[PDB]
Amino acid sequence: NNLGTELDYDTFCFYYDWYGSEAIDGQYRHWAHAIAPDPNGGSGQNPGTIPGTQESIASNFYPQLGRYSSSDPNILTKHMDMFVMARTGVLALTWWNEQDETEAKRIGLILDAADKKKIKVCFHLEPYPSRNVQNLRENIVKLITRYGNHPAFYRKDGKPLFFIYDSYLIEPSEWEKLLSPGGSITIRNTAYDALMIGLWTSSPTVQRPFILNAHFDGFYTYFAATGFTYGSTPTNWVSMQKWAKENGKIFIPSVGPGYIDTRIRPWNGSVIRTRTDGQYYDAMYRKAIEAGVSAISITSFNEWHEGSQIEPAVPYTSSEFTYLDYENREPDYYLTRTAYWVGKFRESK
Numbered sequence: 001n002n003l004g005t006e007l008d009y010d011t012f013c014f015y016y017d018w019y020g021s022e023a024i025d026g027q028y029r030h031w032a033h034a035i036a037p038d039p040n041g042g043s044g045q046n047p048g049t050i051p052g053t054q055e056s057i058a059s060n061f062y063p064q065l066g067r068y069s070s071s072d073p074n075i076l077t078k079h080m081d082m083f084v085m086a087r088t089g090v091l092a093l094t095w096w097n098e099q100d101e102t103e104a105k106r107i108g109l110i111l112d113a114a115d116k117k118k119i120k121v122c123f124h125l126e127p128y129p130s131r132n133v134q135n136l137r138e139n140i141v142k143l144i145t146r147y148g149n150h151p152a153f154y155r156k157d158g159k160p161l162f163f164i165y166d167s168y169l170i171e172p173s174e175w176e177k178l179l180s181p182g183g184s185i186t187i188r189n190t191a192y193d194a195l196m197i198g199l200w201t202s203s204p205t206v207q208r209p210f211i212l213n214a215h216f217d218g219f220y221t222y223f224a225a226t227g228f229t230y231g232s233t234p235t236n237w238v239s240m241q242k243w244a245k246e247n248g249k250i251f252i253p254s255v256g257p258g259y260i261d262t263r264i265r266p267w268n269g270s271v272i273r274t275r276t277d278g279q280y281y282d283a284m285y286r287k288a289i290e291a292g293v294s295a296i297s298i299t300s301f302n303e304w305h306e307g308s309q310i311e312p313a314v315p316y317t318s319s320e321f322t323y324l325d326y327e328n329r330e331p332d333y334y335l336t337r338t339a340y341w342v343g344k345f346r347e348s349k
C-alpha cells in the first residue's frame with residue numbers, strides 16, 4: 001500500500017511506563033509525586049508533594065485517559081492505537097532496572113500490545129543506581145535474551161537499538177570496553193551487538209571526541225525544550241548531522257511539542273516552552289527534517305511531568321489547579337500532527 005498512513009520505523013517516541021492506579025498498583029503512582037526543592041533556594045525547604053488525587057496530579061496538563069495505570073491492558077491498547085494514529089513505529093521504553101515482577105509484567109504487556117498493531121519496542125536505558133558498563137552489558141544481555149525473540153522487539157538492519165540517557169556520566173575509557181570491537185567486554189560481533197545511541201548534551205569540542213572515543217553508534221538529544229543544551233538547539237542540527245555523516249554515526253535528533261514542569265519543579269520556569277497551538281512542534285520537527293537525518297525521536301509520548309507529551313490531554317479545572325490544555329486544538333491534535341510530520345520526513349528519506 002501507498003496510502004500515507006503506514007508506521008515509520010525510523011521514528012522513535014519516548015514512552016514512560018511508571019504510571020499507577022490504586023486499583024492496579026496499590027498507589028496512583030507518578031500521578032502522585034514529590035515537589036522538587038529549588039537547587040538554588042537554600043536549606044530547610046519543605047516543598048511538599050502532589051497527592052495524585054483526581055484534582056491534583058503531577059502534571060501541568062491533564063490526560064484524556066485520566067489517572068491511568070501503565071499496567072492496564074485496556075490503556076495499553078488505546079496507547080498503541082494512538083501510536084498508529086501518530087505513525088510512530090517505535091516505542092522507546094524508559095527502563096530503570098527495577099528488578100521487580102511488576103516491571104517484568106509491564107514490559108511483557110507493552111510488547112504484546114505493541115505487536116497487535118505492528119509497533120516495535122526498543123529500550124531507553126536510564127541512569128539507574130551504580131550503572132556501569134559491566135552491569136549495562138549484563139542488562140543488555142538480559143533484555144535481548146528475555147525479549148529479543150518477541151515479534152515486537154525492534155531491530156534496525158538486524159541490530160537491536162538502545163538509547164542511553166546520561167551516557168556522559170560514564171567515561172569514554174569505560175564505554176570503549178563495551179563498544180569498541182577490541183573492548184575487554186565488547187558486544188561487537190556477539191549475539192548481543194546493538195546500535196548504541198548516546199545522549200549528546202554540550203558543545204562539539206566536548207561531545208565529538210566523547211562520541212568517537214566511547215565508540216557510540218550514534219547520538220540523540222532528548223530535551224524537548226529548545227536551547228536547554230547545545231544538542232537541543234535546533235540551529236545546530238545541520239552541523240551535527242554533517243559531523244555524524246563524516247564520522248559514520250547515526251544522529252537521531254529529539255523533537256517535542258513544548259515543555260513545562262512547574263507543578264513538580266516550581267523554580268524551573270525558565271525552561272518553559274509554550275506550545276502555541278502546535279507552532280512550536282512544527283518548528284522543531286521542520287528543523288529535524290531539514291537537517292537531513294535518517295531517524296527522529298519524539299520527546300515524548302507521555303512524560304506528563306515535563307509537559308512534553310503528545311498523548312491526548314483535555315481541559316480540566318479542579319478546586320486545586322487549573323490545568324493547561326491543547327487550547328484551540330483538539331485533544332488528539334499532537335497525534336495527528338505527528339502523522340503529518342512523519343509524512344514529510346518520509347518524503348525526505
Ligand SMILES: OC[C@H]1C[C@H](O)[C@@H](O)[C@@H](O[C@H]2O[C@H](CO)[C@@H](O)[C@H](O)[C@H]2O)[C@@H]1O
Pocket residue numbers: 094124126127165303305306
Ligand atoms: O527519560 C530521560 C529523563 C527524562 C525526564 O527528564 C525525566 O523523565 C527523567 O526522570 C527523572 O525525572 C522524573 C520527573 O520528570 C522523575 O519522575 C524520575 O523519577 C527521575 O528519574 C528521565 O531520566
